[PDB]
Swiss-Prot record, chains A, B:
Belongs to the herpesviridae major capsid protein family. Self-assembles to form an icosahedral capsid with a T=16 symmetry, about 200 nm in diameter, and consisting of 150 hexons and 12 pentons (total of 162 capsomers). Hexons form the edges and faces of the capsid and are each composed of six MCP molecules. In contrast, one penton is found at each of the 12 vertices. Eleven of the pentons are MCP pentamers, while the last vertex is occupied by the portal complex. The gene is MCP. Homomultimer. Makes the hexons and eleven out of twelve pentons. Interacts with triplex proteins 1/TRX1 and 2/TRX2; adjacent capsomers are linked together in groups of three by triplexes, heterotrimeric complexes composed of one molecule of TRX1 and two molecules of TRX2. Interacts with scaffold protein; this interaction allows efficient MCP transport to the host nucleus. Interacts with capsid vertex component 2/CVC2. Interacts with the small capsomere-interacting protein/SCP. It is found in: Virion; Host nucleus. It comes from Human herpesvirus 2 (strain HG52). This is Major capsid protein. It comes from the Viruses.
Length: 49, 49
């Protein structure tokens, strides 16, 4: 809401202005990288023992 | 396990490595001696007293 200042004399008259605006987000879908090993995750998570 | 940063972008999902580093031992000898004369063998033993 942009304010104004009264101006004297032979001048244009200052009018109260407002500005309404919107944006959008941006995704940029992030990844990672993982590597468990064969004879590893099954062995230590309940496949035998 | 090396520090990884989750990566964005259109790249191929980069190759994940989580392994056990193997290293090479060296063998070093650190040799040391001391003499012992023709005395202190007939001595120290009862042989010459």
């Amino acid at each position: 809401h942009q304010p104004l200042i009264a101006r004297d004399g032979p001048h244009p008259v200052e009018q109260p202005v407002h500005n309404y605006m919107t944006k959008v987000i941006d995704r940029r879908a992030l990844n990672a990288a993982f590597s468990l090993a064969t004879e590893a995750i099954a062995l230590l998570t309940g496949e035998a023992l």
